Amino acid sequence: LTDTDRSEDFLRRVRGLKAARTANGPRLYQPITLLWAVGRARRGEARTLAWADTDEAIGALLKRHGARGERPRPDYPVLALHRAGLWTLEGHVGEVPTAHGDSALRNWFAEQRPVGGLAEPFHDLLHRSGHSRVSVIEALLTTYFAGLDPVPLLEDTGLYDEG
DNA sequence: GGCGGCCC
DNA sequence: GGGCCGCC
């Protein structure tokens, strides 16, 4: 195996992601979100986290490392990663919205304030398997950071040695 | 038209 | 709250 079974399923969901495009490349919301979660999985940090702390932590990485003009709005990639089955959200009424729109996304997180994080099987996988971490880091760097310097982001996520 | 997103 | 773009 389930490590090999889960790793292949994990990497398949990551490769199926469809990020929004700028003129010169895909926007960095989803890879920055994922690498934040990968670092947390590696160090065994709390998988399930309150939205206020998740929003602030991802937002700070968006501000510092948003090399294609990203806004500090983690609501976009979190919703997209949830739809892909990579992210869990708990404590909300009704259905989770898609990452389409703007104000409705912010208002939904402000009202529902869901608790969540990377899905439990993938968090556990990346905590246990250094090979799975290296695999997804390389794949995300290949897809999203062509012509960009990922080193400051890797050190801010605690993944410099593995990336 | 849907979904990931920016601009008002 | 809205319209709209890129890509599917």
Give domain status of residue A162, yes or no.
no
Range of the domain at A107: 3-156
State the Cα–Cα distance between residues A34 and A150, nearest whole angstrom: 14
Give domain status of residue A77, yes or no.
yes
Distances (CA, A) of A53 to A17, A87, A88, A99, A115: 25, 16, 15, 20, 10
Q: Is the CB of A26 under 7 A from strand B?
A: yes
State the Cα–Cα distance between residues A94 and A86, nearest whole angstrom: 19
Residues 6+ positions from A111 with CB-CB distance below 8 Å: none
Give domain status of residue A150, yes or no.
yes
Rounded distance in angstroms from the CA atom of residue A161 to the C1' atom of nucleotide B2: 39
- Provide the domain count of chain A: 1
State the Cα–Cα distance between residues A130 and A149, nearest whole angstrom: 23
Sign of CA pseudo-dihedral A31, A37, A41, A44 = positive
A83 CB burial (10 A radius; 0-12, 13-18, 19+): middle
State the Cα–Cα distance between residues A47 and A39, nearest whole angstrom: 11
Give domain status of residue A114, yes or no.
yes
State the Cα–Cα distance between residues A60 and A44, nearest whole angstrom: 21
Rounded distance in angstroms from the CA atom of residue A9 to the C1' atom of nucleotide B3: 22
- Nucleotide B3's nearest residue (CA vs C1') is A100
Give domain status of residue A130, yes or no.
yes
Give domain status of residue A39, yes or no.
yes
